[PDB]
């Protein structure tokens, strides 16, 4: 799996990577229970303060077969920073994850999906795989019981049908965990799909998901 190169598509047949940004949050526990119910493994791209404050959730993620990835400490668009600012965004997050897991993610997702050549260079240098998305649910814009189905689920089905398989949602949001995640899992199960972690969907052994 190359480092410092935008990845948007799984490479394993019949897999889909449900991925959740900006946590962990107060809704993460209900989301993990829901995932285990469907034997589904997901990927959580986590933030600095949320990770510092929630080392138990990180551990529940790993213990339960999920992948913890990096989402920067402060959620700042990385093309806005110079070499040292990008680097510090990643290393400050590593230093708050390592005490919880004993290791740090070697996969990350750029905030707002924004990259440029400089951020990919830093990610190559820090040994990160850079995960974007091919199914964007826009769940953060659709936080209402009708919107989250009308648009976010609809977007999910339309992009899934078009062959998209790295699904972006945010487990910080109530309606994502209360309504969208259940609808996406029912769809996974109905179709014949394997919901697994981003690393596994890319043919990477679990050992390579951390460094
Ligand atoms: Cl629908
Ligand atoms: Co984010
Ligand atoms: Na790709
Ligand atoms: Na635990």
Numbering used by the authors: 27 to 237
Provide passages from the article that reported this PDB entry.
Combining mass spectrometry and analyses of acetate release, it was shown that AnCDA catalyses mono-deacetylation of (GlcNAc)2 and full deacetylation of (GlcNAc)3–6 in a non-processive manner.
Despite the fact that no metals were added in the crystallization solution, there is clear evidence for a metal ion bound to the His-His-Asp triad, with a peak >14 σ in the 2Fo-Fc map. The ion, refined as cobalt, adopts an octahedral coordination in which the other three ligands are a bidentate phosphate molecule from the crystallization solvent and a water. The phosphate ion in AnCDA occupies the position where the acetyl-group of the to-be-deacetylated sugar, i.e. the sugar bound in subsite 0, is located. The sugar bound in subsite +1 interacts with Leu139 and Leu194 that form a hydrophobic pocket, similar as for ClCDA9. This cluster is composed of Tyr53, which is a phenylalanine in ClCDA and tyrosine in all three putative A. nidulans deacetylases, and Tyr200 and Trp201, which are unique to AnCDA.
